[PDB]
Amino acid sequence: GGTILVVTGTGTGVGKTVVCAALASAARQAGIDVAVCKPVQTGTARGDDDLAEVGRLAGVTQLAGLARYPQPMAPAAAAEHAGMALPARDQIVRLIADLDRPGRLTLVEGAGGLLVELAEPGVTLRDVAVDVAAAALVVVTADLGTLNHTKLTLEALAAQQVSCAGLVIGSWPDPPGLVAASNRSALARIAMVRAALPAGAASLDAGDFAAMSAAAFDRNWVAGLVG
């Protein structure tokens, strides 16, 4: 097989999809095949579709989903509202596994924060990362409160020995205020910071987003992800 990265976050809203898209973009400009996989997707009745957005921004055509719920809630709530069920654990692993392939980077965006239930019972993205032997890349903010949330997330990745690919600062303000700059230094002491995506990048166009994306990440880190 190839490489699997689950792309996680300190909470919901933190920039996960833009990161999936940015790293997928950057990898494709390294000749690296990329699939992105959104196993649980809630809030589709509000037009949320994280798979479509990665394609829309990065041009990834290898987009893989499974469950979709209408209401923008926790997947257990969104399922329970629609009368539906969550996937079983093996369905999410099977979905990633068939995507897996040597020379290919498969990114797996979960639904919100690391410990959000994704499959019955209490199965989270962290359990799924164990099953497919994936490292997790953790998307963070610069806002107040982020150091605690991150530290909590990494402590959780360690309890099941899920390696940390590092952190990406999801939205980097320009200019950064005093809190933002400090936290940027503080998180760099907590883990390798892989990139800091400039705020509002979801309004850059194809070429702009790709330029931004090639800039955001270290070439040697990206190319080192798949051999």
Residue 170 binds which entry of a second copy, ligand DCP, Mg ion, none, CB below 5-8 Å type-dependent: ligand DCP
Report whether 36 belongs to an annotated binding site: no
Report whether 12 belongs to an annotated binding site: yes
The answer to whether 82 and 71 have CB atoms below 8 angstroms apart is: yes
Q: What is the per-residue binding string for ligand DCP in 20-59, x denoting contact by CB under 6 A?
A: ------------------------------x---------
Annotated active-site residue 38? The verdict is: yes
- Least separation in angstroms between residue 56's CB and ligand DCP is 11
Report whether 44 belongs to an annotated binding site: no
Q: Which residues pair with 105 in a beta bridge?
A: 3, 34
70, 151, 198, 214: residue in contact with ligand DCP (rule CB under 6 A): 198
Hey, is 92 helix, strand or coil? Answer: helix
CA 197 to chain centroid:
13
37, 125, 197, 210: residue in contact with ligand DCP (rule CB under 6 A): 197
**In the sheet that 104-109 helps form, which strands lie side by side, from edge to edge?**
63-68, 33-41, 104-109, 3-9, 135-140, 164-172, 193-198
94 Cβ contact list (under 8 Å, min separation 6): none
Residue 25 or 146: which CB sits closer to a second copy?
Answer: 146
120, 200, 215, 224: residue in contact with ligand DCP (rule CB under 6 A): 200
**What are 63's two structure tokens?**
């987009």
Active site residues: 38
